[PDB]
Amino acid sequence: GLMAQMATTAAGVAVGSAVGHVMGSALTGAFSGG
Amino acid sequence: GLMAQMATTAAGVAVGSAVGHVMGSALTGAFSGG
Amino acid sequence: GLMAQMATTAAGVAVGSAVGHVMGSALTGAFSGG
Amino acid sequence: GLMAQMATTAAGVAVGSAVGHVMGSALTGAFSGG
Amino acid sequence: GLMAQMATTAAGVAVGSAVGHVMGSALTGAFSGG
Amino acid sequence: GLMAQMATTAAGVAVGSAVGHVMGSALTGAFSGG
Amino acid sequence: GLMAQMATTAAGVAVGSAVGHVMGSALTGAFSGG
Amino acid sequence: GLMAQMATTAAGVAVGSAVGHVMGSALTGAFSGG
Amino acid sequence: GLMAQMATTAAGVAVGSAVGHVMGSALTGAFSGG
Amino acid sequence: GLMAQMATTAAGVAVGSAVGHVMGSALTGAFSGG
Amino acid sequence: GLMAQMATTAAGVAVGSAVGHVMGSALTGAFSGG
Amino acid sequence: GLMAQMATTAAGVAVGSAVGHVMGSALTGAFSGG
Amino acid sequence: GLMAQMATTAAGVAVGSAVGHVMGSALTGAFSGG
Amino acid sequence: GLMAQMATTAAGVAVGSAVGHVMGSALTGAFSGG
Amino acid sequence: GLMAQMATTAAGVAVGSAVGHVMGSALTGAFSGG
Amino acid sequence: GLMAQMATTAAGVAVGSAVGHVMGSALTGAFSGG
Amino acid sequence: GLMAQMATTAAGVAVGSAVGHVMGSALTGAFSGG
Amino acid sequence: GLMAQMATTAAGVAVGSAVGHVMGSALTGAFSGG
């Protein structure tokens, strides 16, 4: 049962590149601004 | 049972590129601005 | 039972490119602005 | 039982390109603005 | 039982291109603006 | 039992192109603006 | 039992092109504006 | 038992082109404006 | 038992072209404006 | 000298709705398929 | 010198609705298929 | 000399909705497929 | 000399919604597929 | 001489929504696929 | 001479939303795939 | 001579949201894949 | 002569959000993949 | 002659958020993969 994640980025000029990977995780977040 | 995720990005000039991958995850989020 | 996801993006000039992948996940989100 | 998702984008000038992939997922969202 | 989804986009100048793919998913959403 | 979905878009100048694919999914949505 | 869906769009200048595909899905929606 | 759907659109200048495909689906919608 | 649907549209200048395809579906809709 | 254009569309289930508006414009298009 | 254009469409189930508006415009189109 | 364009769309379930607006513009497009 | 463009879209479930606005612009596009 | 462009989109579940705005611009694009 | 552009998007579940704004710009793009 | 651009996006669950703004710019891009 | 650009994004769960702003710039990009 | 750029992002759970700002710049980029 192979599980994989890939992400290739290649730019001449990159301003603000971002990559995020999540696998088999349990993320909990809350925002209460104000 | 192979499971895969791929994402290739290639730009001459990229301003604000973003990539997000989620696999087998349980994400919970809340927003309460104000 | 192979499961796959792919996304290829290639631009001369990209302003605000975005890619999102979700597989076998349970995402819960709430918005309460105001 | 192969399941696949693909998306290829190629632009000379792209302003605001977006790609979203969902497979075997259970997304729940709510909006309550105001 | 092969199941597939594809989407190819190619523009000289694209302003606001978008692609969305859903397969074997259960999305629930609500809007309550006001 | 092959099931497939395809969508090819090619424009010299595209302003607001959109593509949406749904296969074997159960989407529930509600709108309550006002 | 092959089931397929295709959509090809090609324009010199496209302003507001849209494509939607649904196959083997159960979409439920409600509108209650006002 | 092959089932297929196709739609080809090709315009010099298209303002507001739209394509919708439904196959083997059960769509339920309601409108209650006012 | 082949079942097929096709629609080809080709215009020099198209303002508001639309195509809709339904096959083996059960669509239910209601309008209650006012 | 007020000039106005309006278009209201409201459907319980719409498959392939399209709207196009042109005002004070000079659109030139050509088709040469084949 | 008020000039106006209106179009209201309201259907329980609409498959392929289209609306096009032109005002004070000069559209030129050509078709040469074959 | 007020000039305006409006378009309101409201559907319980919309598959492939599109809106295009052009005002005071000079669009030139060509198609040469084949 | 006020010039305005508006477009409101509100759907319970929208698959492939698109909006395009052009005002005081000169768009030139060409398609040469094949 | 006020010039404005607006676009409001609000969906319970949106798959592939797109918005494009152009004002006082000169976009030139070419497609030469093949 | 006020010139403005706005775009508001609000969805319970959005998969592939995109927004693009251009004002007073001169974008040139070319596609030569193949 | 005020010139402005705005874009507000608010989703319960957004997968692949993108925003691009261009004002008073001269973007040149080329694609030569293959 | 005030010139401004704004972009607000607020999501309960965002996977791959992207924002790009360009003002008074001259971006040149080229893609030559292959 | 005030010139400004803003971008606010607020998410309960963000996977791959990106922001890019360019003002009064001359970016040149080239891609030659292969």
Numbering used by the authors:
A (entry chain R), B (entry chain P), C (entry chain N), D (entry chain F), E (entry chain D), F (entry chain B), ...: 43 to 76
Question: What did the paper state?
Answer:
Mitochondrial proteins CHCHD10 and CHCHD2 are mutated in rare cases of heritable FTD, ALS and PD and aggregate in tissues affected by these diseases. Here, we demonstrate that the low complexity N-terminal domains of both D10 and D2, as well as the full-length proteins, can form amyloid fibrils in vitro and in vivo. Structures of D10 and D2 fibrils assembled in vitro from the low complexity N-terminal domains of each protein show that their core comprises the most highly conserved region between the two proteins. For D10 and D2, the central conserved VAV motif forms a beta-strand that is associated with the protofilament interface in all the structures we have observed, suggesting that it may be a critical element in fibril formation and may be expected to appear in ex vivo structures as well.
Using cryo-EM, we observed several distinct D10-NT fibril polymorphs (see Methods section on Cryo-EM sample preparation and data collection) and determined three different structures. Polymorph-2, solved to 2.70 Å resolution, also contains two identical symmetry-related PFs, with a fold (PF2) distinct from that found in polymorph-1 (PF1). PF2 is comprised of residues G43–G76 and exhibits four strands consisting of residues M45–A53 (similar to strand-1 in PF1), V55–V57 (similar to strand-2 in PF1), A60–V64 and L69–F73. An extensive inter-PF2 interface is comprised of strands 2–4. However, in the PF2 and PF3 D10-NT folds, some of the sequence variation sites are positioned within the PF fold, suggesting that these D10-NT folds may not be compatible with the D2 sequence. For WT D10-NT, we obtained 2D classes closely resembling those observed for WT D10-NT polymorph-2. We have provided evidence in the form of 2D classes obtained from cryo-EM datasets of independent samples that the WT D10-NT polymorph-2, the S59L D10-NT and the WT D2-NT structures we determined are reproducible and may therefore be preferred by their respective variants. The resulting structure was nearly identical to the WT D10-NT polymorph-2 structure, indicating that this mutation likely does not alter D10 fibril structure.
